[PDB]
Design an enzyme around this catalytic site. Structure first.
Site, PDB file in Angstrom:
ATOM      1  N   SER A  97       0.929  -1.130   0.012  1.00 31.90           N
ATOM      2  CA  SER A  97       0.012   0.105  -0.045  1.00 31.90           C
ATOM      3  C   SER A  97       0.729   1.534   0.040  1.00 31.90           C
ATOM      4  CB  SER A  97      -1.084  -0.132   1.061  1.00 31.90           C
ATOM      5  OG  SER A  97      -2.011   0.786   0.806  1.00 31.90           O
ATOM      6  N   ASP A 219      -9.773  -4.605  -5.858  1.00 29.97           N
ATOM      7  CA  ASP A 219      -9.322  -4.079  -4.491  1.00 29.97           C
ATOM      8  C   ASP A 219     -10.061  -2.627  -4.650  1.00 29.97           C
ATOM      9  OD1 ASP A 219      -7.762  -2.295  -3.000  1.00 29.97           O
ATOM     10  OD2 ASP A 219      -5.768  -3.246  -3.601  1.00 29.97           O
ATOM     11  N   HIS A 248      -7.428  -5.645  -0.405  1.00 32.91           N
ATOM     12  CA  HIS A 248      -6.161  -4.570  -0.601  1.00 32.91           C
ATOM     13  C   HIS A 248      -5.114  -5.110   0.656  1.00 32.91           C
ATOM     14  CE1 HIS A 248      -4.477  -0.669  -0.977  1.00 32.91           C
ATOM     15  NE2 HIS A 248      -4.321  -0.379   0.264  1.00 32.91           N
TER      16      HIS A 248
END
Length: 271
Positions: A97, A219, A248
């Site tokens: 991320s 996602d 995610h």
């Protein structure tokens, strides 16, 4: 043991392998525990470095300097300080991320420290723009920040299922809701703002280290086209793998699928 870095970031080093050093860096709302399913696969060949990003649930909020973290640069400086303390000649860096982008920014400064970057669930910009699809309009952000500031706990419970994906009652959804709620709510709102409004697209041509771009087919925060965008704009060699997973944080919620993918990208170098 290693001092301020260990105290401040809960830094842990495990593994006794000799093929090199792997650094694992988690995204917003989780902590180094997000890697629990990956680490056992790495310790035979590698030395594995895990750490919590400043402001993560297990960190001391007294160390959170709001001016330092007003841009993602502060997180990249923290990473460079960790790598320097560790006396690493180079490392394989796996960034989940926001940590994918943090690693990429760090690699612009010190490309020598990184033999490759594995970018998991990465995006250079969440907001849509002209001819760019990131998945979010400004209205969506305002709604998100409004919930976060109205009742952070309720926000965490409602957001976790959307972000993790799959079944609502899963261990993974519960775990992420908990790690999200471990963030002090003022830090959570501040950092979310910093992340959701960041745009590093124009920096991607400076990244010269090879990059492996890995994400879930479904996602919430990362449309599949973002992987293609990264692939077309990074300044070095890259490869994309879109996994038949949802969510995610798929290394936490679908490790049976995701860990084999991550291990392959770690082990195999692109020309």
């Amino acid at each position: 043991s290693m001092g301020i870095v260990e105290e401040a970031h809960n830094l842990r080093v495990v593994g006794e392998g000799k093929r090199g050093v792997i650094v694992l860096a988690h995204g917003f709302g989780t902590d180094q525990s997000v890697w629990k399913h990956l680490v056992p696969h790495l310790v035979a060949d590698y030395r594995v470095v895990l750490f919590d990003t400043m402001g993560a649930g297990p960190t001391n909020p007294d160390y959170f300097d709001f001016s330092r973290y007003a841009t993602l640069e502060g997180y990249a400086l923290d990473l460079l300080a960790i790598l320097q303390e560790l006396r690493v000649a180079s490392c394989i860096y796996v960034g989940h991320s926001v940590s994918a982008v943090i690693g990429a920014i760090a690699s612009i400064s010190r490309p020598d420290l990184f033999s490759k970057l594995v970018l998991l669930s990465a995006s250079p910009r969440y907001l849509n723009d002209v001819d760019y699809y990131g998945g979010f309009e400004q209205e969506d952000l305002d709604e998100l920040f409004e919930a976060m500031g109205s009742n952070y706990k309720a926000w965490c419970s409602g957001f976790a299922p959307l972000c993790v994906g799959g079944d609502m009652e899963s261990v993974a959804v519960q775990e992420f809701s908990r790690t999200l709620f471990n963030i002090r709510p003022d830090i959570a709102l501040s950092v979310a703002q910093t992340i959701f409004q960041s745009d590093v697209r124009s920096l991607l041509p400076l990244v010269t280290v090879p990059c492996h771009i890995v994400q879930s087919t479904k996602d919430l925060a990362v449309p599949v086209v973002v992987s293609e965008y990264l692939h077309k704009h990074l300044g070095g060699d890259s490869i994309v793998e879109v996994m038949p997973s949802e969510g995610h944080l798929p290394q936490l919620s679908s490790p049976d699928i995701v860990i084999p993918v991550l291990l392959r990208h770690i082990q195999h170098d692109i020309a």
